[PDB]
Amino acid sequence: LYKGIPRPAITNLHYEPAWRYTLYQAGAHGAQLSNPRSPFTAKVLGDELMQVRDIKSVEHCKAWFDRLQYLINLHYEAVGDIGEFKSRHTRHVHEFFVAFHDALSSLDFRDTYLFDQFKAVRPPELSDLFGIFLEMEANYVHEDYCPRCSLPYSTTRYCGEGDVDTPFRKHRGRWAPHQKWGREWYDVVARRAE
Amino acid sequence: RQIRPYYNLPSKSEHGRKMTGFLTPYRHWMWKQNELWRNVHEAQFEHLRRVYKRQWLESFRVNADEYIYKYNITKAAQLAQWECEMKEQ
Amino acid sequence: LFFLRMWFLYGCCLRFVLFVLCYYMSPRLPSSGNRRVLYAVFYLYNFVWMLRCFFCCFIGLVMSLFIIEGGGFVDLPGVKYYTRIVS
Amino acid sequence: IAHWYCGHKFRHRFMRDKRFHPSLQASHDARNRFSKRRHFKTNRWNYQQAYRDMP
Amino acid sequence: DQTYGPHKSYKYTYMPDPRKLAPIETTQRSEIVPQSIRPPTSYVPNHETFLERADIHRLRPTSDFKASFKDWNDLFTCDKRQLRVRGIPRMTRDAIRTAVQAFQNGNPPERFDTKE
Amino acid sequence: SFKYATKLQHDEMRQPYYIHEKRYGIFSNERNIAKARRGLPFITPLYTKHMNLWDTDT
Amino acid sequence: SRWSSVWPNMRYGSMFLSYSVGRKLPMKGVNWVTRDSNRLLNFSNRYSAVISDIDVKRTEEELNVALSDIRWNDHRRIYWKCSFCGSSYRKNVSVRTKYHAGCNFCKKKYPSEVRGEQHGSPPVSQAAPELTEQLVDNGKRDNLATLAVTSKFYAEWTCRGCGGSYRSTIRSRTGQVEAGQCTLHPDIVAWSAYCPSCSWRPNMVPIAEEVSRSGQFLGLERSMEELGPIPRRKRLAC
Amino acid sequence: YRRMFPEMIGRTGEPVQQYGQMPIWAGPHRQHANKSEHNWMFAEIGVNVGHEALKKLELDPTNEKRRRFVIRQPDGTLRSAKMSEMRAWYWKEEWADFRFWAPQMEWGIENTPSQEQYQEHVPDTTDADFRKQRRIQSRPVKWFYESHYTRTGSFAGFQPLRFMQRRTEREVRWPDVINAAVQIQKRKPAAYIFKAIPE
Amino acid sequence: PWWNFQTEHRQRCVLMYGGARTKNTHNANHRVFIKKYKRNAFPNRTRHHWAVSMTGVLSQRPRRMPWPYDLTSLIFNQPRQGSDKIGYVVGTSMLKTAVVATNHMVYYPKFNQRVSRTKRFFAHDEDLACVEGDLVHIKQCRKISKYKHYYVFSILEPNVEGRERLKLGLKAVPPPLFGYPVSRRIVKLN
Amino acid sequence: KVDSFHANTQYQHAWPLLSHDDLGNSDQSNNTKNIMYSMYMPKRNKGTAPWFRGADTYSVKYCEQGRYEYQRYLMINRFPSEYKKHFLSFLSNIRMSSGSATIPQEALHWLLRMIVDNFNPQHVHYIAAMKTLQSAGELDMARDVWKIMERQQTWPCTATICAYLDVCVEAGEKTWAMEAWNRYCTELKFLEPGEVDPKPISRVPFSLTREELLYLPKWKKHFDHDPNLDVMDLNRFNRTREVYLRMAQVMLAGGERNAFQHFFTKLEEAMLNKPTPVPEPPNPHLVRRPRWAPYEHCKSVHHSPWRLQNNGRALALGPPVTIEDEMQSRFFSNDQFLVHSVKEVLRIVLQEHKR
Amino acid sequence: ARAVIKRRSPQLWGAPGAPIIRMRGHHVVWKFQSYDLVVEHTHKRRNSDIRLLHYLGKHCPHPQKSLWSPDTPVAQDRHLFMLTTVDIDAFKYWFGVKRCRLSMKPWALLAKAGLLPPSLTQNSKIMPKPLFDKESLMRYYLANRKDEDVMAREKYLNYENSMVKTEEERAAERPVAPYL
RNA sequence: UAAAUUAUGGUCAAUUGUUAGUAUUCAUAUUAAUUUUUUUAAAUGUUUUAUCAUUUUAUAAAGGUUUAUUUUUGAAAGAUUUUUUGUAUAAAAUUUUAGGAAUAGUUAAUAAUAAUUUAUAAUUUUGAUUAGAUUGUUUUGUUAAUGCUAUUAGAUGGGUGUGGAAAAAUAAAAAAAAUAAUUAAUAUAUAUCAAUAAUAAAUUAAAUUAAUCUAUUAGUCAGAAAUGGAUGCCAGCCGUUGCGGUAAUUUCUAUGCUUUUAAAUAU
Ligand SMILES: [Mg+2]
Ligand SMILES: [Mg+2]
Ligand SMILES: [Mg+2]
Ligand SMILES: [Mg+2]
Ligand SMILES: [Mg+2]
Ligand SMILES: [Mg+2]
Ligand SMILES: [Mg+2]
Ligand SMILES: [Mg+2]
Ligand SMILES: [Mg+2]
Ligand SMILES: [Mg+2]
Ligand SMILES: [Mg+2]
Ligand SMILES: [Mg+2]
Ligand SMILES: [Mg+2]
Ligand SMILES: [Zn+2]
Ligand SMILES: [Zn+2]
Ligand SMILES: [Zn+2]
């Protein structure tokens, strides 16, 4: 037992807590403001400096929304002709909206800072969003245009002709003739609105 | 390199180099100017050198010390455990 | 797999050779005929070896060097190397 | 087994491996593993009086 | 024993991605730092005088390519790819381009002739 | 247990570097890197063995 | 030579290359005919603009390709003249019809390239109307005055000093960029006034002036005169 | 679920903030330099950083040894990384959970593009794919009309046996015709005949 | 990418995502032996070379690797491997030099088993305490002469018997009866 | 590793997938999803499902961990020779690491780093660190040295106590000096007529009988040079009077009369009525030793003919600051030390007036 | 000090020289080319690894589209990206404590990152290099020069110790009643 | 010498040949390779300086080594003046050949000794020394797997001994003491040993900048696929049992026909 060496004094440190120190603080080496959202930082920086600091995020959010309502006011009535061979597609607005909503909700991009900005950035007329989208579903059902691709019946032979973003024409795929209104697509529109 | 212009003092020799670096007072003055500019650069530069030196030394102080905290606690724990095992022994 | 029949390929898949002789030899019964055998030479590390091989090839206008290729077995016992093209 | 190590047969390889086997190694009991027979009967006719300095 | 070659040719479709073709935001570096050309000096009046004073090395024979340059602006409008187009050999052409950008920096081609 | 875990060229299959510090002192190799005869073939031997296998201590 | 074998660079714009035997061979097997359901000129109810963009003299000279022989989806690359900015380019009809493939310039036609029409900035005819005369005259000057003052469009102008032609950017000329894009060089206005060659002289004047006054030039001067309540953080220095 | 477990839908995040720039003594002479064409991402590595094992501790705002990123915008300012950018610097990670709704799975009929699924090019038309046993397809934007909780994830974690498998081998050595079971394909004809096809 | 098939390859210059950047050394070469001598005359007395020889050390099959887990590392904490050895003293014919026989360990991972090999060292003992047949503790030190890097640190077990044998004027241990083996037959009678 | 056609170090940390141009799958415009899974990602072997290295494959329990708790106690021993070499090195590094380039806080750095390397910071190191730091006039870091020494449970010898009390006085914190006193120097005595001398060195130094060597566990045989072993014998020269003196100085420094009166009275009385303790010879590891050199090749005072250069052989420039011309404080007689003590107390009065 | 100088790859001051931070990669077709920030000695051998002090990171000189982030209507963010991995602690160690050297291209990188002010070799050829004269400078300096001790305190906090002890933590660390 | 639960936790081990009584890892299979194909290299003049000099510029020629290869700061980094410190040259383990015998400027003590100091010396059968082959202890291929099977290259003695360190006699792709240059990654047609190219190998077209290329083979008894015509133990086929005897579905030729489509074939 007591043969062979004296018991190392540092053993004491196990039994008496008096000897557990840390001479220095956590970020005392110059990292103190690492935590952006710590009370300590809110005290060091003060509020207006914090505003100055997060302004970039605020204008990110504002940007997403401004794009959204530009696209809405452009494509709101779904069937018109807005350009040379190009015409309005609800689908445009739809897919942008999904991009945004993935910015918030997806687990690959998880950019959730975007949602902390809504109580300020969000436009007062855009608060209803799925309501507006419903109204668009109403406008989308006009009879001169294809139920599927929303191109005009007169001037256009195929679905997705001269649309940059079309789903219905893929690379080495083939062209698809217009589909006609009737009970099928009527209740398609129905179900989407649902 | 060290730039030797054509209007440096020419050396006439067949046994060696054709041009010795020696300066027109103009070239000397010019050199002083350009040099001053560069001085303005390295001032900030090596200033940042010693800044980072203290940064690193400080962060070492803090982290290494924390490491001694945790490690010593470990070492004490093991030593306690050992002498226990020897009481049992 | 019989690894000793390849002795004169010396670890190589194909070989070059110079023509010397062509004689004929009678295969192991019950297979009769005349099998054409070409007697060839090549050199490695300044040693000149005489390689003895089956002649299956097509000979056109008179030519010298062939390309020796590996195995399989044939009627004729002791024949191990075969001919690919003639140069 | 690569065919170029040791002899032209396989069994030659395993026969050389037996010189490297762990439980087969040379010691104070098992000696002269590689040539036992060159040393056999070597001292039969060599008469050596054993060593005694003690009565 | 493998005389037969691969069992399959593995091939992947090309299917263009809507997200990769999306319009890219672009700037030209001539906006951020504007490009300009230096007017000839009395020291260096024209492009061949330039090629004359920028000729030093035996193996960077600048002054012989005078005909591949019509003028001043053509010299400083040139870059290395387009300089290879015109068939100037290699280290020669980099001595030339080096010279030009050097003169652009406030440092004219004044350097002792090594050839001797 | 597979071929991928044979490849030590992943850093996830290999005992990390810092161990060699924990044994010989920290920043101890920067000395050895400036040595006259190095890397041809041999470098100052680099000890990385998972610390619970260490023959010395355990 | 050797290096001829090297594949070119495909930037982010371009799709499938077709540089290898495997990439050519399946398409080598498609033979087209113009059957009147294919003819471009039939479909002018839609594609009318695309019909008026075609360079009719040039295409029939170089390509030996009739204008009656052009499909609306046609894959052969033919020459075009942009009916907007008046620059010539070579594309295939297919790519202008399936997606919009323009003149490569009018790509940058609007500012920002990303948000297309979202500009709230006035046209050039308004903000700085004095730029409209400096345009090289191809006859399209009325269209290029329609562009944003902020537009990133690459336009060619006749230099004031030597009366030759160079090419710069409309917003590089104006000096106005849209909020939240990249700020340009603070001097960009004075420096795009003239040729790449002619611009040195006028802008080197104020420098010479400031070394005439104080005998000493440091680019500092502007920033210094920017100096003649700012919230600031508590510091841990104490 | 939404009522009883409000914190399973993340509503909070690390705000994108701008860093203060270091002073440049050289003044305007160099003030052009850090302003350029592109965005510049800088992710940090080191012995204490870049280990997937520790990932969340490293992206934690509360930890001060936390791995640092910076991004210089083309105008020359610098900001903290968006969380997407932060995560870009770790080996790609699969989240798919099977307990309530079916996650979208790879190497299906409608998923796999042509060349892997069949060894021929098959035309993609949005109508009448006989091979895929579908009548017609309207193609709305994928996640738009569906409920968001219904989106789960994607499972890529298995071998796609039609396409490529382990220990590839000939099923039958004789006759010489059969290959490994991944080589299915129609016979190529005697030399190709091309019919003109405007029709 | 080593995990991609022969036909799956596109670029040879880079790893697209991750993994290990590997060089394929061509392992199957059909390398061969050249026969340069007659089987009758081979230019060596003991050993003859008739086939390709396996050329590694520790690359060499079946693998035998250094094992630092035996008795010696069990009793000691060594600052550097081989800084401590326990052994028996065999012979002292050299003043202040004790020869020591010592065991160490080898591991064959193929067979998952160990062997003890043995090795001799020259130890410097100032003052000639050691007798043949002592169990001694031995340490690494200053280079002393051409071959002696070890010194006798402690005698664990002295030879009581051997010392007494010495005091009486006799050798510590009787000299071995036969020397090394021979390939000859020695006929020596009476 | 780096700069080669096959270079691993560059793929060894995670990177987002690069499509700048055609990489052979025409990555610029091509949707690479299945290309990603089947081709680009590394697999367990050719044809196996992709091996995922992502953050979700590792268990949760990696982030439940406190810091450095994965470390296990490491007994690294090394030859005696090497201990000498190493303590010396750390000493000369704590003194100064770089020429003008040394920051005071570097002393602290080097002490810490010596701990981190699994060496034991002997007494010499602590004293040296303390005197260095105090001399640079940085007073908090000196106490930090002390706190480090307490945490290692190293029993401060008398010399060390002196040093730390010097830092206490200069800082004028009585609080530190009281705890330091109360813990370590309490039982400290003076020398009386019966008491004997420098006490001889009584420690054995540590060896092993063959049965100790063979039958003990490994840790019982592990000797790192450890203070607390030699503490008894560092104190064999009785520097106590110094400790009492410093302690007086402190109780005065913090403005308390009674305590000061106590210490100074004890000291005075003992200085009059007890024998003068034999002083310790110069410590080899602090003050070094004068190795022999001929001074022959030297710069010969008039070397530069513009001025008088000082020289290693003789000092020709005259003293820059007056030196008191008294031997080190421990060589004094007892009476002399009494006097010295009064002068000390006055010096502290002065210092406190200037604070 | 070589009898016959290795002519093509000269260097200052013998081998191995100072630690220097270089950017290097094996040469290949421009499409795939990457670089390595490496702290290493001045004199390299056949393989760059023999003298390699530390590995500072990968740098890819291909502007990249950000597909990692969701496609963002903000103008700035859709500029192409340039990707670089810096190891900043070994940088601050080698540069700060060990006093490194620097090649120019790495310098430009480390400038874009905010670790270093932009290099000497980055020139807007728009402006010229400045002029100088001692008495104008002197007038400006007499106009603005801070106080002695303020400046000494600056030099203190920047170069020497930063973290300091305010009154409160002293008062918090000094021993209480039973040992006080 | 008792069970266990607050229940799938600590993150995937999984084997595919049509054979020929039977015994024995052995022909024809896949994966990896060589057969196999110009998309990554490159040209000469290193450079300052105080002038016939002096400062800076340290590991790719060959030979064949298995108890073998080991080292400093005095150079530079490098911070203020002058003195200023100590740490290093040493070892340990892993070492091939079917049939096996002695090796030698030689060990240890003395010591800045001894071509003749002293001694009962050293290496070896626990495999030495010569000799053969061979570039040593994170690199590959196959595999479900203890295995089997690769890994280049790079240190070749001394003789006015310079230099911090011999690494010092073409063969860079390392900015080398003023910011030469970074709008750069392009280098034409050479080499060495590497560096896997039939990159949608066949029908809707290239959100280009249109630049390099005009691209094919096998089998045809057994086992996907045959008819004429010759030939007649011949000529020839042959991975393999074997085929060829005037009717050969196994040879040669013509035509068709067969294939699961980076080729057959040899190693
Ligand atoms: Mg063979
Ligand atoms: Mg046969
Ligand atoms: Mg093959
Ligand atoms: Mg294996
Ligand atoms: Mg050599
Ligand atoms: Mg030999
Ligand atoms: Mg050895
Ligand atoms: Mg050795
Ligand atoms: Mg010689
Ligand atoms: Mg059949
Ligand atoms: Mg046949
Ligand atoms: Mg007949
Ligand atoms: Mg027939
Ligand atoms: Zn339609
Ligand atoms: Zn246009
Ligand atoms: Zn002009």
Side-chain angles (χ1 to χ4, degrees), chain G residues 184-195:
Chain G
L184 319 167
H185 193 127
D187 293 343
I188 193 62
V189 215
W191 274 101
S192 58
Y194 298 136
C195 276

PDB file of all heavy atoms in Angstrom, chain G residues 184-195:
ATOM      1  N   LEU G 184     -20.279  51.312 -58.150  1.00  0.00           N
ATOM      2  CA  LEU G 184     -19.161  51.353 -59.086  1.00  0.00           C
ATOM      3  C   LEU G 184     -18.026  52.212 -58.531  1.00  0.00           C
ATOM      4  O   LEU G 184     -18.143  52.780 -57.441  1.00  0.00           O
ATOM      5  CB  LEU G 184     -19.619  51.897 -60.437  1.00  0.00           C
ATOM      6  CG  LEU G 184     -20.978  51.413 -60.942  1.00  0.00           C
ATOM      7  CD1 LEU G 184     -21.431  52.277 -62.110  1.00  0.00           C
ATOM      8  CD2 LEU G 184     -20.928  49.943 -61.334  1.00  0.00           C
ATOM      9  N   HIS G 185     -16.932  52.303 -59.283  1.00  0.00           N
ATOM     10  CA  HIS G 185     -15.843  53.212 -58.946  1.00  0.00           C
ATOM     11  C   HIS G 185     -16.367  54.642 -58.837  1.00  0.00           C
ATOM     12  O   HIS G 185     -17.041  55.118 -59.746  1.00  0.00           O
ATOM     13  CB  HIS G 185     -14.747  53.131 -60.005  1.00  0.00           C
ATOM     14  CG  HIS G 185     -13.458  53.777 -59.600  1.00  0.00           C
ATOM     15  ND1 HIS G 185     -12.248  53.114 -59.645  1.00  0.00           N
ATOM     16  CD2 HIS G 185     -13.183  55.025 -59.154  1.00  0.00           C
ATOM     17  CE1 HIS G 185     -11.288  53.926 -59.242  1.00  0.00           C
ATOM     18  NE2 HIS G 185     -11.828  55.091 -58.936  1.00  0.00           N
ATOM     19  N   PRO G 186     -16.062  55.337 -57.728  1.00  0.00           N
ATOM     20  CA  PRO G 186     -16.555  56.708 -57.505  1.00  0.00           C
ATOM     21  C   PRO G 186     -16.172  57.704 -58.603  1.00  0.00           C
ATOM     22  O   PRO G 186     -16.792  58.760 -58.710  1.00  0.00           O
ATOM     23  CB  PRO G 186     -15.901  57.108 -56.174  1.00  0.00           C
ATOM     24  CG  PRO G 186     -14.806  56.099 -55.946  1.00  0.00           C
ATOM     25  CD  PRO G 186     -15.282  54.839 -56.585  1.00  0.00           C
ATOM     26  N   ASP G 187     -15.153  57.373 -59.390  1.00  0.00           N
ATOM     27  CA  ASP G 187     -14.716  58.211 -60.502  1.00  0.00           C
ATOM     28  C   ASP G 187     -15.256  57.776 -61.858  1.00  0.00           C
ATOM     29  O   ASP G 187     -14.922  58.385 -62.872  1.00  0.00           O
ATOM     30  CB  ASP G 187     -13.188  58.235 -60.580  1.00  0.00           C
ATOM     31  CG  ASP G 187     -12.551  58.935 -59.400  1.00  0.00           C
ATOM     32  OD1 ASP G 187     -13.264  59.673 -58.683  1.00  0.00           O
ATOM     33  OD2 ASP G 187     -11.329  58.749 -59.204  1.00  0.00           O
ATOM     34  N   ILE G 188     -16.072  56.726 -61.880  1.00  0.00           N
ATOM     35  CA  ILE G 188     -16.444  56.067 -63.136  1.00  0.00           C
ATOM     36  C   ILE G 188     -17.015  57.027 -64.176  1.00  0.00           C
ATOM     37  O   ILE G 188     -16.845  56.828 -65.379  1.00  0.00           O
ATOM     38  CB  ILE G 188     -17.473  54.925 -62.900  1.00  0.00           C
ATOM     39  CG1 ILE G 188     -17.596  54.048 -64.149  1.00  0.00           C
ATOM     40  CG2 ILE G 188     -18.833  55.469 -62.459  1.00  0.00           C
ATOM     41  CD1 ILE G 188     -16.292  53.350 -64.535  1.00  0.00           C
ATOM     42  N   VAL G 189     -17.662  58.083 -63.702  1.00  0.00           N
ATOM     43  CA  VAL G 189     -18.316  59.027 -64.587  1.00  0.00           C
ATOM     44  C   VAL G 189     -17.303  59.757 -65.448  1.00  0.00           C
ATOM     45  O   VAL G 189     -17.388  59.736 -66.677  1.00  0.00           O
ATOM     46  CB  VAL G 189     -19.122  60.028 -63.798  1.00  0.00           C
ATOM     47  CG1 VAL G 189     -20.372  60.380 -64.573  1.00  0.00           C
ATOM     48  CG2 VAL G 189     -19.469  59.440 -62.430  1.00  0.00           C
ATOM     49  N   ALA G 190     -16.331  60.383 -64.796  1.00  0.00           N
ATOM     50  CA  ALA G 190     -15.288  61.103 -65.506  1.00  0.00           C
ATOM     51  C   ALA G 190     -14.466  60.166 -66.398  1.00  0.00           C
ATOM     52  O   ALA G 190     -14.011  60.575 -67.461  1.00  0.00           O
ATOM     53  CB  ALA G 190     -14.385  61.839 -64.518  1.00  0.00           C
ATOM     54  N   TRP G 191     -14.293  58.915 -65.980  1.00  0.00           N
ATOM     55  CA  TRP G 191     -13.394  57.995 -66.685  1.00  0.00           C
ATOM     56  C   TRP G 191     -14.014  57.291 -67.887  1.00  0.00           C
ATOM     57  O   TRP G 191     -13.296  56.712 -68.708  1.00  0.00           O
ATOM     58  CB  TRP G 191     -12.859  56.928 -65.725  1.00  0.00           C
ATOM     59  CG  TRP G 191     -11.650  57.347 -64.970  1.00  0.00           C
ATOM     60  CD1 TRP G 191     -11.596  57.776 -63.673  1.00  0.00           C
ATOM     61  CD2 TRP G 191     -10.307  57.375 -65.459  1.00  0.00           C
ATOM     62  NE1 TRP G 191     -10.303  58.075 -63.326  1.00  0.00           N
ATOM     63  CE2 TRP G 191      -9.488  57.838 -64.404  1.00  0.00           C
ATOM     64  CE3 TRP G 191      -9.717  57.060 -66.684  1.00  0.00           C
ATOM     65  CZ2 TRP G 191      -8.103  57.992 -64.540  1.00  0.00           C
ATOM     66  CZ3 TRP G 191      -8.342  57.218 -66.817  1.00  0.00           C
ATOM     67  CH2 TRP G 191      -7.550  57.675 -65.749  1.00  0.00           C
ATOM     68  N   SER G 192     -15.340  57.291 -67.966  1.00  0.00           N
ATOM     69  CA  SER G 192     -16.015  56.691 -69.110  1.00  0.00           C
ATOM     70  C   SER G 192     -16.432  57.750 -70.131  1.00  0.00           C
ATOM     71  O   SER G 192     -16.985  57.427 -71.183  1.00  0.00           O
ATOM     72  CB  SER G 192     -17.229  55.888 -68.651  1.00  0.00           C
ATOM     73  OG  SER G 192     -18.125  56.714 -67.930  1.00  0.00           O
ATOM     74  N   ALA G 193     -16.161  59.011 -69.808  1.00  0.00           N
ATOM     75  CA  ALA G 193     -16.483  60.126 -70.690  1.00  0.00           C
ATOM     76  C   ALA G 193     -15.869  59.958 -72.078  1.00  0.00           C
ATOM     77  O   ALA G 193     -16.475  60.324 -73.083  1.00  0.00           O
ATOM     78  CB  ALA G 193     -16.013  61.436 -70.068  1.00  0.00           C
ATOM     79  N   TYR G 194     -14.670  59.392 -72.126  1.00  0.00           N
ATOM     80  CA  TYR G 194     -13.890  59.349 -73.356  1.00  0.00           C
ATOM     81  C   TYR G 194     -13.432  57.937 -73.715  1.00  0.00           C
ATOM     82  O   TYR G 194     -13.858  56.961 -73.097  1.00  0.00           O
ATOM     83  CB  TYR G 194     -12.681  60.277 -73.228  1.00  0.00           C
ATOM     84  CG  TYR G 194     -13.067  61.724 -73.039  1.00  0.00           C
ATOM     85  CD1 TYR G 194     -12.430  62.517 -72.094  1.00  0.00           C
ATOM     86  CD2 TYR G 194     -14.085  62.296 -73.798  1.00  0.00           C
ATOM     87  CE1 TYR G 194     -12.790  63.851 -71.916  1.00  0.00           C
ATOM     88  CE2 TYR G 194     -14.452  63.627 -73.628  1.00  0.00           C
ATOM     89  CZ  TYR G 194     -13.801  64.399 -72.685  1.00  0.00           C
ATOM     90  OH  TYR G 194     -14.156  65.719 -72.509  1.00  0.00           O
ATOM     91  N   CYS G 195     -12.578  57.840 -74.734  1.00  0.00           N
ATOM     92  CA  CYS G 195     -11.951  56.578 -75.127  1.00  0.00           C
ATOM     93  C   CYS G 195     -11.225  55.936 -73.980  1.00  0.00           C
ATOM     94  O   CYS G 195     -10.807  56.614 -73.047  1.00  0.00           O
ATOM     95  CB  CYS G 195     -10.931  56.786 -76.247  1.00  0.00           C
ATOM     96  SG  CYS G 195     -11.527  56.847 -77.934  1.00  0.00           S
TER      97      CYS G 195
END
